[PDB]
Design a protein around this ligand. Sequence first.
Ligand SMILES: [Zn+2]
Ligand SMILES: [Zn+2]
Lengths: 26, 18, 65, 604, 98, 98, 49, 147, 49, 595
Amino acid sequence: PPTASSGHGYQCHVCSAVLFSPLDLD
Amino acid sequence: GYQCHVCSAVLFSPLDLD
Amino acid sequence: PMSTRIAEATSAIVSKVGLPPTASSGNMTLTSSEIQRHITEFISSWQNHPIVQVSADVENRKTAQ
Amino acid sequence: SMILTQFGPFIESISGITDQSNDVFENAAKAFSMFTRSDVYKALDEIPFSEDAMLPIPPTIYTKPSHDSYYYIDALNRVRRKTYQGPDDVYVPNCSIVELLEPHETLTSYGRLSEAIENRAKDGDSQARIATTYGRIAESQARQIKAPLEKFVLALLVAEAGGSLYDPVLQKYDEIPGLSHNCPLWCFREICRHISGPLPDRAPYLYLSAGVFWLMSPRMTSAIPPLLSDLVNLAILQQTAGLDPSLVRLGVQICLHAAASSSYAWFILKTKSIFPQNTLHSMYESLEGGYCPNLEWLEPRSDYKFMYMGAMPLSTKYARSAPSNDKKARELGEKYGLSSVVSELRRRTKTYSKHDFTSVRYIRDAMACTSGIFLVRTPTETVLQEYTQSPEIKVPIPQKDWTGPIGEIRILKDTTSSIARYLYRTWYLAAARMAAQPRTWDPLFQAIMRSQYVTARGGSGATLRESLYAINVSLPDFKGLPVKAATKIFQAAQLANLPFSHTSVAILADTSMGLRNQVQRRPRSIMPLNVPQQQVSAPHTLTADYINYHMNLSTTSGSAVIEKVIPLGVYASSPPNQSINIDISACDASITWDFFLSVIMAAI
Amino acid sequence: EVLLLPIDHQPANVTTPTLDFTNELTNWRARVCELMKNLVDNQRYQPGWTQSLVSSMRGTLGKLKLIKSMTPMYLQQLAPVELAVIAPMLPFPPFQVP
Amino acid sequence: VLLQRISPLQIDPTIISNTMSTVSESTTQTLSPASSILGKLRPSNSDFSSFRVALAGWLYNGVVTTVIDDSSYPKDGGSVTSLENLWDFFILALALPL
Amino acid sequence: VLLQRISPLQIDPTIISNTMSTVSESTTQTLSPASSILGKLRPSNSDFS
Amino acid sequence: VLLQRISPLQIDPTIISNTMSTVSESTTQTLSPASSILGKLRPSNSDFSSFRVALAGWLYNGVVTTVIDDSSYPKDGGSVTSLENLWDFFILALALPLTTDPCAPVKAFMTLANMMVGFETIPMDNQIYTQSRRASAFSTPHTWPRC
Amino acid sequence: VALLSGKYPPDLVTNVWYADAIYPMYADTEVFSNLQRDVITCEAVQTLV
Amino acid sequence: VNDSFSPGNDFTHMTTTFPSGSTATSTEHTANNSTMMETFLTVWGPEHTDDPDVLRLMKSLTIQRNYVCQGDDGLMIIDGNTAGKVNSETIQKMLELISKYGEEFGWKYDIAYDGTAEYLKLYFIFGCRIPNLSRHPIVGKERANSSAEEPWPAILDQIMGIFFNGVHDGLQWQRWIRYSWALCCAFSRQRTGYLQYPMWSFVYWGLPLVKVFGSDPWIFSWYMPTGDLGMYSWISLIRPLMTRWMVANGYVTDKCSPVFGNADYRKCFNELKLYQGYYMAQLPRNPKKSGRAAPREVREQFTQALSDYLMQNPELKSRVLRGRSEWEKYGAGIIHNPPSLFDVPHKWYQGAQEAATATREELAEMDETLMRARKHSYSSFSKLLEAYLLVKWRMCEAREPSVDLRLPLCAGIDPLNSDPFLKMVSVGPMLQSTRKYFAQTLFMAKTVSGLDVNAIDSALLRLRTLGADKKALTAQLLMVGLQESEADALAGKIMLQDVNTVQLARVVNLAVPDTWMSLDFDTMFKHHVKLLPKDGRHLNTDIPPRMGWLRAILRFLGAGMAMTATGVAVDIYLEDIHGGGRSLGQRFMTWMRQE
RNA sequence: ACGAUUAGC
RNA sequence: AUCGU
Ligand SMILES: [Zn+2]
Ligand SMILES: [Zn+2]
């Protein structure tokens, strides 16, 4: 059940900051 | 990825974390 | 202006019934949602104070009379 | 846009956009290191300003007279500035400086003070002495900045290129106008453009380690170097505090009026209580609500035990009952041609009738809008203006109320009708309770109190050695070692073997001078007393410590806002219990040998 | 011309008061502390606690019962005087039920 | 406010701090009654205006019935095996008669 | 999973932790029955199917 | 000073610390009687000067009444549940008999009677000079309690 | 907290303290004004009926 | 007066003003102010007044109750009666009386009656502080003489001071942080070759950082403790994400670490220059002109002169010699550098040599030291930081508010300024003067100049924790100069007593940061940081009954994390210690046996 | 023959 | 405050 996420991150639309991973992004 | 709690180590395969 | 800016900020930070409940209705990092949940708990704890629940800064039309 | 092209990653790093790493930081640091001042001014010119950022600039800042008609030579062959407005017009004149510049080598468009005038003053000419004194004083005025101002301007430009910042708690962007609404920065750009003129160089002056260079031009005056720092301070404060544009525009108007006057420092000293007296001293003429702390500080008083018990609503009867501050404010605004600013402030103040956050923020902005610079003036003038005033005693102690001299002290009989009897009694009881109290005889206490003044800092050792050699007593000298020879530790080492009888002559030595500038206040002169002269005044400070520790309610607080009695002010400012501010003007010259010291020495 | 009080009033015959424990509030506090002590000393509860913690609780209860507070004395013999002084001049006269 | 301005008594919680600092207890224990009660005895929102208002409510019992707020009671019943709840019960029982 | 939709019995698994936190024991001891029972129970959230 | 010049008695500055360093205690406990008394009874040898002043005051009791200072008494009232107050009571009890104050015994009784009110009560004469007055406020010869 | 912790000033005399604290209040005399409004309220209700 | 701005302007001047810069000036000024105000309130006042109400007011207040004076300035408090606030006309007449009274003996009171309060340049209205922004200029610095400015590390220190001054004045936190970072980057590079300070050094100096390792931007506040505690706080806050970020890109090591796991933190930190910045930030920022070569026997007679000056009374020298004797008997070098009265001349000589101009060779040595520190590679952190990282914490529930959210306590802090507003509302301002509270912690009130009371107390507490005989403490106190009986009694007292967290903290070099001193930190240190975990004893966080001083260090270790994070201050519970309490205490002891 | 001189806290 | 000029 611990699911860390690595790589392939992108930007967020509400705040223009860039996140590390897609799961962290969502 | 899957991360151990007592020591922060990320193990890719879901089964070797146990 | 600064008055409406302060009012908007206060409303945003603060603002987030009698009916029975129904079925219809380890390695912890630091996160924006994690801060938000503490902020919500703090503000709920403040709002649930008996003195705050009835305290007012300006009197109404009949207390002055 | 050149800032963006040359700094792309760095803004995104420090604005919460992307990650903050070291390579981007080092590249940006290198770009900061290699960035010419003219390039800074070009990037400044690239700013697309708007209206609401433009305030008229008088034409009289540039066209100013010379310096000869402002100084003169009095008796005793001394140089000082003649006064035109009272006895405080002794600060730096706003006159032109161009005719005193000789071009520096390796760059034609910059110069410094000419060595010809320096030599002609050295060998004894009068006008040359006046010119070099004016040049050095203007240099000192211009040299009151931490670092070259272009670095701060460029750092502000880079920081504000990021735009609005998201707030994680408020979940929205911060609504603060951009650089296009920055009035002080536009004024800075306009002043630099007008001074530079056809010349390719755009910096009005360049600040080096020791000395600065002036860009010669007929429009250059001596009021520019403080004005530029003032405008940059105002712009930084506006950007980093969310100051409203109107108050900043009023502050810039005040600064420009000060520059256009006869003396910048004198005018800014005369007008230093415009904002605090119109805004802080006049709010809440009519209250309808708000919350104030219900402080209550306990009966144990010397320990400052403060307790906080909720907040109580403000009643209507807790209005401003103090006498109105209108007449003197209006008169001051009329005297110095600042009627519009005062009227605007008074009209704006009356619109706040509730003690919410907005009124407090408006007060903070108003107090922030005042001009903060380090006033500077010639030491021979601060000495002649501060150390010549004497107290005015209208009812002195009668001559018949004293006795015969105990050496050089006459005890004051307790049958006197003067008010000094109670002061004498208090000091006498303090001295007795000290002398009976036993810790003042343990050798450790004496060693500590003897080592209090022994500090690695100057204490006028030259006068000490001169006075002590005047009686043919020789003190050892140390040569070849790298210790400083002008410190009190050196004096202590020199005064080791000598007894008190030989060193008692040095008590009457002539103290050396000292000086340090201060913000919006006249500079203070300080006289450091030599080591035996510190020593001889031990019982005075000790009984004063006893008084301040037991007899009265007082504090000996520290330098920073963190180490201060903040609660006491919060308690004293609450509406139910109003307070009075009592200040003593020129307390240094207050106490003399006529009344205070005369009573105190006998009491001790 | 009569005002009621939930607690009884016993006037003071001296103008230099000082701490004493003879009044209902201090009696109530002492009895609560004694009841807590008896609850701790219950044979169904003492074995559940360690030896040192029982002594710590007993000492805390004793100090709490023997604390030096003048609030009970004030409520007994000075609060009614202030209430009766304030009550007449007041924008809303006292409205009371027995 | 009038009572607070006229009364000679003033509230000072340092007496409790001193009388609980002078308590004897062992360090190796896993919970300390003195520290527990000291932490519990700090009012929420740091307001102490719930006592003068309580006194002023005596004048008006026909219209105002001053009751103890819900949050004062323990969140879910309680347990005498728990020292924090025991201290909460002490507070409630000592404050109710006012 | 059908009975889950109907049953009003909700777990707050912190009940055991809260009721076991306030248990008197010395630090010098080496068994800690509260820690033993907590480590044996391992209160989780999915342990109700 | 004349007493100090010729008196053979002297300091011995280590007896108090030597007789407290060998007290068997437990480091787990928070309160420590030896560390409390060693801090409450700090010697500085101005004590000997004060002692000789008190001793020389014996010769003049018709003009001088060498009462004990008020600061020595516990602030407000003491508590028998307080180790510091108990040690202060010990210090006061040892110090009082050497004074020339006629009302020394009643003060010695009241310095203990004060610090244990409520815990242990005795009757008083009037309600002004009650059981919880300052022990130093019993200077008059006929303020001695009938109890 | 208020019940458990509260002390008087170290040296007070109750009659002097109350005579100091009560005087300002008595001078204000707004007690008299209300009575007049009560009279006119009673007259108003009676004339209304 | 021999100035430099005007040639041929040397002269002498006789003046009657009381000297400024003397030892006794401020104390006697305050004493005289208090005495004159008291005599006015007592005798002069009623003798020159007629109205009854003003007399009633004047008989009511005394300087012991409501008057606070410090030097030139002063403040008087008029308390409210039952009928509201005191009438203004009586106050105005009394102020006129004060003005008349002050001129009799040559004083001109500058009296302002505006409804606000001013004291030590602090402005308050209706119980709300107001920081005067203009009094603290950003680009200004006072210079009296025409001396040249100090080198570049000095301007680094000045920029850090500017940032701290902005912190105390309550600016817009996000914008102020961004601008401080901009200045940081601007002033970070200087040529001689070129020298640069890696960002991490500036972070170690106390400047908060915005967004690293792909975390959430604007996540750390500036209440970050400066120094080592500060590094631990943010590293422990963001560790489980730091390890993930390290592993995600080319940093994997088969060895498992108790702190970071299977991530090659060594190579990553060396590449990121984090070790380089952390170590370089500790180097001195002034030229080491101290220790410059001196001909011998001259320094010797100099030091002998200071030694003779310091100790003229033989008995104090006898005390020091005894203290050294029993120190050699018992100390046996358990602590490396015990302070003593004989080393005061050496410190005075170093300080007197320090206040001098530095030659070019000293600056060259400084730049060589910085370059060598930058070029070097470091295997691991300092011992204290590695010991701190072994502690894990958990944050469950936020504190209940300590101040009403509608009460303005200070300007600049409001809903527009989220972080300071939430921090002050959750924690609360300090309602006690910090000076007395800090004073009550010290064992010795004052010491001879050239020695530090903090150093003496730290040595005493180290000699307690590292087991040592009582005699060692007696010898140390004798070496400080205390009398033998008092030294013995104080050592006996120190041996067994327990002391609050601040003093114990000093044992490992930890002090409350100057930023926290505006808030009520003591209550958080006492109550809202609990060493017992929320789910009982874990048998791993078992502090032994010996080395019980570990609790204070753990309290700051938790409090740094509790205060660093943005938003509401949250109650924090101890979770786990890797090596065990006794192992961590052994690490602290083996560090104490150093320095 | 001139020259990089200062408080207290 | 003499070797800087
Ligand atoms: Zn987003
Ligand atoms: Zn693992």
